[PDB]
Scaffold this motif. Structure first.
Motif, PDB file in Angstrom:
ATOM      1  N   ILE A 177       0.660  -1.255  -0.055  1.00  0.00           N
ATOM      2  CA  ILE A 177      -0.069   0.008   0.013  1.00  0.00           C
ATOM      3  C   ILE A 177       0.987   1.275   0.073  1.00  0.00           C
ATOM      4  O   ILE A 177       0.149   2.427  -0.301  1.00  0.00           O
ATOM      5  CB  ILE A 177      -0.899  -0.133   1.135  1.00  0.00           C
ATOM      6  N   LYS A 178       2.209   1.264   0.348  1.00  0.00           N
ATOM      7  CA  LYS A 178       3.170   2.374   0.451  1.00  0.00           C
ATOM      8  C   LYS A 178       2.911   3.243  -0.924  1.00  0.00           C
ATOM      9  O   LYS A 178       3.231   2.752  -1.832  1.00  0.00           O
ATOM     10  CB  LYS A 178       4.520   2.053   0.756  1.00  0.00           C
ATOM     11  N   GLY A 179       2.551   4.407  -0.743  1.00  0.00           N
ATOM     12  CA  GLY A 179       2.835   5.357  -1.940  1.00  0.00           C
ATOM     13  C   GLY A 179       1.401   5.654  -2.398  1.00  0.00           C
ATOM     14  O   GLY A 179       1.229   6.599  -3.119  1.00  0.00           O
ATOM     15  N   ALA A 180       0.578   4.984  -2.333  1.00  0.00           N
ATOM     16  CA  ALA A 180      -0.995   5.396  -2.292  1.00  0.00           C
ATOM     17  C   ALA A 180      -1.259   6.848  -1.820  1.00  0.00           C
ATOM     18  O   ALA A 180      -0.900   7.020  -0.865  1.00  0.00           O
ATOM     19  CB  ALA A 180      -1.899   4.434  -1.875  1.00  0.00           C
ATOM     20  N   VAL A 181      -2.138   7.505  -2.589  1.00  0.00           N
ATOM     21  CA  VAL A 181      -2.527   8.903  -2.324  1.00  0.00           C
ATOM     22  C   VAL A 181      -3.833   8.961  -1.950  1.00  0.00           C
ATOM     23  O   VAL A 181      -4.831   8.262  -2.663  1.00  0.00           O
ATOM     24  CB  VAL A 181      -2.255   9.801  -3.483  1.00  0.00           C
ATOM     25  N   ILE A 182      -4.367   9.383  -0.669  1.00  0.00           N
ATOM     26  CA  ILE A 182      -5.645   9.680  -0.064  1.00  0.00           C
ATOM     27  C   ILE A 182      -6.026  10.971  -0.322  1.00  0.00           C
ATOM     28  O   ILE A 182      -5.284  12.008   0.206  1.00  0.00           O
ATOM     29  CB  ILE A 182      -5.765   9.365   1.144  1.00  0.00           C
ATOM     30  N   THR A 183      -6.953  11.447  -1.064  1.00  0.00           N
ATOM     31  CA  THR A 183      -7.531  12.627  -1.330  1.00  0.00           C
ATOM     32  C   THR A 183      -9.131  12.853  -0.833  1.00  0.00           C
ATOM     33  O   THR A 183      -9.806  12.235  -1.441  1.00  0.00           O
ATOM     34  CB  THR A 183      -7.583  13.007  -2.878  1.00  0.00           C
ATOM     35  N   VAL A 184      -9.142  13.703   0.156  1.00  0.00           N
ATOM     36  CA  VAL A 184     -10.514  14.117   0.543  1.00  0.00           C
ATOM     37  C   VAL A 184     -10.860  15.520   0.268  1.00  0.00           C
ATOM     38  O   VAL A 184     -10.147  16.381   0.683  1.00  0.00           O
ATOM     39  CB  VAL A 184     -10.584  13.677   2.149  1.00  0.00           C
ATOM     40  N   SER A 185     -11.870  15.535  -0.721  1.00  0.00           N
ATOM     41  CA  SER A 185     -12.296  16.799  -1.482  1.00  0.00           C
ATOM     42  C   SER A 185     -13.443  17.122  -0.846  1.00  0.00           C
ATOM     43  O   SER A 185     -14.333  16.380  -0.783  1.00  0.00           O
ATOM     44  CB  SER A 185     -12.080  17.123  -2.705  1.00  0.00           C
ATOM     45  N   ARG A 186     -13.500  18.504  -0.717  1.00  0.00           N
ATOM     46  CA  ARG A 186     -14.924  19.298  -0.565  1.00  0.00           C
ATOM     47  C   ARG A 186     -15.333  20.005  -1.931  1.00  0.00           C
ATOM     48  O   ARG A 186     -14.695  20.852  -2.297  1.00  0.00           O
ATOM     49  CB  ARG A 186     -14.884  20.188   0.689  1.00  0.00           C
ATOM     50  N   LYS A 187     -16.350  19.942  -2.216  1.00  0.00           N
ATOM     51  CA  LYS A 187     -17.011  20.784  -3.184  1.00  0.00           C
ATOM     52  C   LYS A 187     -17.825  21.997  -2.676  1.00  0.00           C
ATOM     53  O   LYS A 187     -18.359  21.909  -1.481  1.00  0.00           O
ATOM     54  CB  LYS A 187     -17.876  20.389  -4.455  1.00  0.00           C
ATOM     55  N   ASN A 188     -18.044  23.163  -3.565  1.00  0.00           N
ATOM     56  CA  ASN A 188     -18.654  24.428  -2.893  1.00  0.00           C
ATOM     57  C   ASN A 188     -20.239  24.152  -2.489  1.00  0.00           C
ATOM     58  O   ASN A 188     -20.757  25.027  -1.950  1.00  0.00           O
ATOM     59  CB  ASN A 188     -18.422  25.820  -3.601  1.00  0.00           C
ATOM     60  N   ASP A 189     -20.772  23.009  -2.913  1.00  0.00           N
ATOM     61  CA  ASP A 189     -22.024  22.593  -2.695  1.00  0.00           C
ATOM     62  C   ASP A 189     -22.172  21.817  -1.331  1.00  0.00           C
ATOM     63  O   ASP A 189     -23.240  21.526  -0.997  1.00  0.00           O
ATOM     64  CB  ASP A 189     -22.653  21.528  -3.435  1.00  0.00           C
ATOM     65  N   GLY A 190     -20.968  21.627  -0.779  1.00  0.00           N
ATOM     66  CA  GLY A 190     -21.038  21.090   0.871  1.00  0.00           C
ATOM     67  C   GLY A 190     -20.676  19.424   0.778  1.00  0.00           C
ATOM     68  O   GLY A 190     -20.530  18.740   1.852  1.00  0.00           O
ATOM     69  N   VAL A 191     -20.540  19.004  -0.351  1.00  0.00           N
ATOM     70  CA  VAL A 191     -20.343  17.563  -0.412  1.00  0.00           C
ATOM     71  C   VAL A 191     -18.716  17.214  -0.559  1.00  0.00           C
ATOM     72  O   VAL A 191     -17.924  17.832  -1.178  1.00  0.00           O
ATOM     73  CB  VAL A 191     -20.878  16.836  -1.727  1.00  0.00           C
ATOM     74  N   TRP A 192     -18.593  16.133   0.343  1.00  0.00           N
ATOM     75  CA  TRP A 192     -17.207  15.689   0.251  1.00  0.00           C
ATOM     76  C   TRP A 192     -17.197  14.201  -0.353  1.00  0.00           C
ATOM     77  O   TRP A 192     -17.790  13.461  -0.444  1.00  0.00           O
ATOM     78  CB  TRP A 192     -16.466  15.507   1.643  1.00  0.00           C
ATOM     79  N   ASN A 193     -15.852  13.869  -0.959  1.00  0.00           N
ATOM     80  CA  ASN A 193     -15.743  12.739  -1.368  1.00  0.00           C
ATOM     81  C   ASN A 193     -14.123  12.172  -1.161  1.00  0.00           C
ATOM     82  O   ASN A 193     -13.305  13.034  -0.829  1.00  0.00           O
ATOM     83  CB  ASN A 193     -15.973  12.569  -2.957  1.00  0.00           C
ATOM     84  N   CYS A 194     -13.919  10.853  -1.021  1.00  0.00           N
ATOM     85  CA  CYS A 194     -12.697  10.324  -0.828  1.00  0.00           C
ATOM     86  C   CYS A 194     -12.381   9.357  -2.129  1.00  0.00           C
ATOM     87  O   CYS A 194     -12.945   8.473  -2.517  1.00  0.00           O
ATOM     88  CB  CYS A 194     -12.771   9.465   0.416  1.00  0.00           C
ATOM     89  N   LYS A 195     -11.103   9.564  -2.463  1.00  0.00           N
ATOM     90  CA  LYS A 195     -10.502   8.768  -3.618  1.00  0.00           C
ATOM     91  C   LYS A 195      -9.021   8.377  -3.237  1.00  0.00           C
ATOM     92  O   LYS A 195      -8.133   8.965  -2.661  1.00  0.00           O
ATOM     93  CB  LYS A 195     -10.601   9.504  -4.997  1.00  0.00           C
ATOM     94  N   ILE A 196      -8.873   7.391  -3.739  1.00  0.00           N
ATOM     95  CA  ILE A 196      -7.374   6.814  -3.546  1.00  0.00           C
ATOM     96  C   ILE A 196      -6.763   6.452  -5.100  1.00  0.00           C
ATOM     97  O   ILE A 196      -7.319   6.201  -5.919  1.00  0.00           O
ATOM     98  CB  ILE A 196      -7.307   5.291  -2.843  1.00  0.00           C
ATOM     99  N   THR A 197      -5.381   6.949  -5.276  1.00  0.00           N
ATOM    100  CA  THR A 197      -4.854   7.217  -6.393  1.00  0.00           C
ATOM    101  C   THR A 197      -3.303   6.608  -6.146  1.00  0.00           C
ATOM    102  O   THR A 197      -2.931   6.353  -5.262  1.00  0.00           O
ATOM    103  CB  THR A 197      -4.736   8.670  -7.182  1.00  0.00           C
ATOM    104  N   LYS A 198      -2.821   6.220  -7.425  1.00  0.00           N
ATOM    105  CA  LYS A 198      -1.310   6.190  -7.316  1.00  0.00           C
ATOM    106  C   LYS A 198      -0.983   4.691  -6.515  1.00  0.00           C
ATOM    107  O   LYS A 198      -0.067   4.683  -5.527  1.00  0.00           O
ATOM    108  CB  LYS A 198      -0.395   7.260  -7.031  1.00  0.00           C
ATOM    109  N   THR A 199      -1.880   3.812  -6.508  1.00  0.00           N
ATOM    110  CA  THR A 199      -1.669   2.721  -5.966  1.00  0.00           C
ATOM    111  C   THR A 199      -0.620   1.818  -6.316  1.00  0.00           C
ATOM    112  O   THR A 199      -0.422   1.581  -7.436  1.00  0.00           O
ATOM    113  CB  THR A 199      -2.926   1.681  -5.956  1.00  0.00           C
ATOM    114  N   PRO A 200       0.152   1.008  -5.504  1.00  0.00           N
ATOM    115  CA  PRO A 200       1.294   0.164  -5.941  1.00  0.00           C
ATOM    116  C   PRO A 200       0.809  -0.977  -6.657  1.00  0.00           C
ATOM    117  O   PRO A 200      -0.196  -1.368  -6.705  1.00  0.00           O
ATOM    118  CB  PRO A 200       2.187   0.016  -4.769  1.00  0.00           C
ATOM    119  N   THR A 201       1.915  -1.730  -7.024  1.00  0.00           N
ATOM    120  CA  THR A 201       1.807  -2.744  -7.964  1.00  0.00           C
ATOM    121  C   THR A 201       0.985  -3.860  -7.390  1.00  0.00           C
ATOM    122  O   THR A 201       0.197  -4.577  -7.836  1.00  0.00           O
ATOM    123  CB  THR A 201       3.035  -3.392  -8.598  1.00  0.00           C
TER     124      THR A 201
END
Length: 124
Positions: free
Chosen positions: A86-110
């Motif tokens: 799992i090392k190197g994966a990026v966790i991105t927790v983002s808010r849009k101006n409508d108030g909604v949050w979402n979580c996405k994982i990117t750059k997962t290792p092999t």
């Protein structure tokens, strides 16, 4: 082993996602959101404590973008004690101006497996 990896990803997602509450408080107070040991009086630190699952040190483990109009990004990278699958994966927790949050994982290792990402923070 996979269960430890899955536990670690879910815990790290929880550590970043827990900061949304402080972020919402800053938005109510009209103060800029930061993750900093030296916030200014017009800024609001989001109260993060260093995680042994994330790359980096102290409050800099969370990289914050805040346009001060409700659009916010909290970004962290798996590291330190996190396993090689799992090392190197990026966790991105983002808010849009409508108030909604979402979580996405990117750059997962092999060696990332499909169920390492929890349903609440899928791999893009």
């Amino acid at each position: 082993d996979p269960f430890t990896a899955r536990t670690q990803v879910t815990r790290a997602v929880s550590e970043v996602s827990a900061l949304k509450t402080a972020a919402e408080s800053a938005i109510l107070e009209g103060k800029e959101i930061v993750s900093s040991a030296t916030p200014k009086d017009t800024q609001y630190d989001i109260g993060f404590t260093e995680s042994t699952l994330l790359d980096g040190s102290g409050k800099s483990q969370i990289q914050v973008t805040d346009n001060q109009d409700g659009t916010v990004e909290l970004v962290a990278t798996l590291g330190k004690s996190s396993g090689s699958a799992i090392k190197g994966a990026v966790i991105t927790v983002s808010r849009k101006n409508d108030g909604v949050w979402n979580c996405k994982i990117t750059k997962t290792p092999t060696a990332w497996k499909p169920n390492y990402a929890p349903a609440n923070c899928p791999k893009s």
